[PDB]
Ligand binder design. Structure first.
Ligand SMILES: Nc1ccn([C@@H]2S[C@@](O)(CO)[C@@H](O)[C@H]2O)c(=O)n1
Ligand SMILES: Nc1ccn([C@@H]2S[C@@](O)(CO)[C@@H](O)[C@H]2O)c(=O)n1
Lengths: 231, 231
C-alpha cells in the first residue's frame, strides 16, 4: 500500500472507479493487479486495491467472537474503504480498481443480522452512517459481476490456508464453509438487484459488465471496458 | 503497540480502565507510560495507550480538508478506540491506561459541528453509532481530570513540531492555535459535566480524581489511586 501511495496526505474532479462485485472469498488479487497495470500502461495513475488492505488486525474475531466484534469490524470495512476512496479517487483523482465497492458492504452486515451477531438496532445505526458516507462517494463507473461458486472459493481458500499464504480466519472448517455459502447466496440476490438498479435504479450512469468464457477471455473483456475510461 | 500486544486475536471479566480527560493536545505519553509501568510493578498486565495509536494515516486531512474528512476521521477515532478497548479491556481482561476514554470523543465531533465541518445529519448518525458502541464498553474505573492551559499546550506543540518529533498536523499556525483553544474551551465545559455526572449521572460507580501541586505530586496522587485497583 506504500508502493501504491494509498495514504498520501499531500496536495493533489474524481478519477475513475472500477469494481468487481462477487463472493471473492479467496480473492481476485491477480485480476485487479493485472487490470490496474493495464490502465497504468495506458497512462492512468491506477492502483488495484484488494480487500486485504481493509482487513482489520482484529478480523478473526468477527468470526470467532461474532456477537461482540462483527458490528465494529463491519464498521471498519465500510469506514476504511470510504476513506481510501475519498482520498484517492475523489480528492486526488486517481483510478481505483477495487476488489469490492462501497455498495457491497451492507450485504455483509445483513448476513450478521440474520445470524444474530449484529442486532437490529446496530444495523439501523450502521445504515444511518452508511447513508451519510456513501452520499459522498461517486458510484463506480464500471462494475464487473463475478460471483464464483462456493466449492471453488472453498478449494482455493483451503489451499491458501494449508500453504500458509493466508491465516485461517474462521473458528472451524464448518464455519468457514457456512460463511462462504451465506455470502454466495446473498451475492446471487445482490446481483439480481444490480441488474435492476443499473436500468431502473441509482446505477443508470454506470456500466454494468456481466461475463459469459475462459479466464483469458474474461480478463480481456474487463480490460477492454476499463480502458475506455483512461484519458 | 506490538510490544504492548495490543492487537492479539488469540484466546484470553474485564480488566481495569484508567483514563485521563483533558485537552492533551501535546500528549501525556510520559505520564500514561509511567503510570502503566507502576501498575505492571504491582502485578497487572497494564499498558499505556497514547492517542497516537489512533491517529489515522489521513489525520492531517481532518484539519486541512475538514469539510470532507472530519466526519470519517472522527468515526475512526471512536471506532479504533472502541475495538482496542473491546479486545484488550473486555475480552482479554487487561489493564488500560488511556490518554483519552471513549466518553470524550463526542466533544470533538461537537467542535466540528460548530465550525460547519460536520453537518447536523452527520452528527445524528455519529451519535446513533456512538450510543451502540459505548453501550458495550464499561465506564472507566478511574478518570483523572487534567486540562492544561492552551498556552502551555501550544508551547509544547511548537517545540515538538520544530524539532521534528511530530508532524505539523494543522494547515496554518492560526488553525493550530484555534483548534487547541476550541478544544480547551469545550473541555472546561466537559469537566463541569463530569463533576455532575460522577455524583448524579451515569458515573456514580467511577472514581473521579481532580488534582490540586507539583508534577511530582500529581503523578504520585494518580498512581496511588490507580494502584488501589491492582489485584
Ligand atoms: N464488509 C466485508 C467485506 C469483506 N469481508 C470478508 S473479510 C475477507 O476478505 C477475508 O479474506 C473475505 O472473507 C470477505 O468476504 C467481510 O467479512 N465483510
Ligand atoms: N476524537 C479525537 C481525539 C483526538 N483528537 C486530536 S488528534 C491529536 O492527538 C493529534 O496529536 C490531538 O490533536 C487531539 O486533540 C481529535 O481531533 N479527535
Amino acid at each position: 500500500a506504500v508502493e501504491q501511495n494509498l495514504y498520501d496526505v499531500g496536495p493533489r474532479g474524481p478519477g475513475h472507479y472500477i469494481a468487481i462485485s462477487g463472493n471473492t472469498a479467496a480473492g481476485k488479487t491477480t485480476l485487479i493487479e493485472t487490470l490496474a497495470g493495464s490502465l497504468r500502461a495506458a497512462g492512468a495513475d491506477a492502483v488495484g486495491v484488494s480487500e486485504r488492505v481493509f482487513h482489520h488486525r482484529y478480523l478473526k474475531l468477527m468470526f470467532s467472537a461474532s456477537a461482540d466484534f462483527a458490528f465494529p469490524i463491519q464498521l471498519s470495512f465500510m469506514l476504511e474503504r470510504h476513506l481510501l476512496l475519498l482520498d484517492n479517487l475523489v480528492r486526488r483523482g486517481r483510478t481505483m480498481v477495487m476488489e469490492r465497492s462501497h455498495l457491497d458492504d451492507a450485504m455483509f452486515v445483513r448476513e450478521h443480522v440474520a445470524s444474530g451477531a449484529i442486532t437490529a438496532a446496530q444495523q439501523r445505526a450502521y445504515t444511518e452512517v452508511s447513508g451519510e458516507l456513501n452520499a459522498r462517494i461517486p458510484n463506480p463507473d464500471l462494475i464487473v459481476l463475478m460471483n464464483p461458486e462456493p466449492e471453488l472459493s472453498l478449494e482455493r481458500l483451503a489451499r491458501a490456508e494449508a500453504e500458509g499464504s493466508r491465516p485461517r480466519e474462521f473458528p472451524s472448517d464448518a464455519a468457514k464453509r457456512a460463511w462462504v455459502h451465506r455470502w454466495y447466496d446473498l451475492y446471487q440476490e445482490l446481483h439480481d438487484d444490480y441488474r435492476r438498479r443499473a436500468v431502473d435504479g441509482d446505477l443508470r450512469g454506470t456500466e454494468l459488465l456481466e461475463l459469459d468464457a475462459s479466464p483469458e477471455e474474461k480478463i480481456a473483456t474487463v480490460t477492454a471496458r476499463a480502458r475506455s475510461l483512461v484519458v
